[PDB]
């Protein structure tokens, strides 16, 4: 029995994305954030292509396809970054990209140190919880369906169905090698707790990037086209409470 679903997730997983950062220059707030913004712009393209290739995604109304990506990109990218940090440098640093690795000094220089420490904590959890590559893939996919508008999507029912199916796939991945129903429940508890922990981080980053865009001209930080549009149009819907994450607990 070939695992079709996981086969697909592995196949569509985005390759390496570089930020284009000049590491030969002394670190500066403006340069680091401008590079993170460009990295975001570059990653957004890969996330869109990735999402459109996910099982069942095309079934969502096109407007909803765009909206869910516009609302979930921060969480998705932060989660993938934590995994890269864990696998590449054992969480010793934040591995945003091969050419953009943050040690504590850079975390401080970026003016979002607390957020960076929380992301480092997220990265360590992949190790502490012994998250498998297959669990990572399924969890990352679920993150794309974890934040919706209070007013509902154009075809909310299709979204609910898709989300349920991805949760079911996570159940299957958990059940693999687990004959004890209690061990499966305990694992599901751990993974949903981890998924929930991504949201508070994403929200703090949403707040930070929103404030930065508003004063970007004052601090010499450049925002690429898509990033500027999304942070000025969709992100505010999240910050104002019109779009909310779907938490498993609490």
């Amino acid at each position: 029995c070939q695992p079709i679903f996981l086969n697909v997730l592995e196949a569509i997983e985005p390759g390496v994305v570089c930020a284009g950062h000049d590491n030969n220059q002394p670190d500066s707030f403006a340069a680091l954030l401008s590079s993170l913004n460009e990295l975001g712009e570059r990653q957004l393209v890969h996330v869109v292509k990735w999402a459109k290739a996910l099982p069942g995604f095309r079934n969502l109304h096109v407007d909803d396809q765009m909206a869910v990506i516009q609302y979930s990109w921060m969480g998705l990218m932060v989660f993938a970054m934590g995994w890269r940090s864990f696998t590449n440098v054992n969480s010793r640093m934040l591995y945003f990209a091969p050419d953009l690795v943050f040690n504590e000094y850079r975390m401080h220089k970026s003016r979002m140190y607390s957020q960076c420490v929380r992301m480092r904590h997220l990265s360590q959890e992949f190790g502490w919880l012994q998250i498998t590559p297959q669990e990572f893939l399924c969890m990352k996919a679920l993150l794309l369906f974890s934040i919706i508008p209070v007013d509902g999507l154009k075809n909310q029912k299709f979204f609910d169905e898709l989300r349920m199916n991805y949760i079911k796939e996570l159940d299957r991945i958990i059940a693999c090698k687990r004959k004890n129903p209690t061990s499966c429940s305990r694992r599901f508890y751990q993974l949903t707790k981890l998924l929930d922990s991504v949201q508070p981080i994403a929200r703090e980053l949403h707040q930070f990037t929103f404030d930065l865009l508003i004063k970007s001209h004052m601090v010499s930080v450049d925002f690429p086209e898509m990033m500027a549009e999304i942070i000025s149009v969709q992100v505010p819907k999240i910050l104002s409470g019109k779009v909310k994450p779907i938490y498993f607990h609490t």
Binding site: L44, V45, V48, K49, V62, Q65, M66, Q70, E225, M226, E229, I230
Partner: peptide
């Protein structure tokens, strides 16, 4: 927009 164009 540039983002929306990813669907064209």
């Amino acid at each position: 927009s540039k983002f929306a164009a990813l669907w064209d």
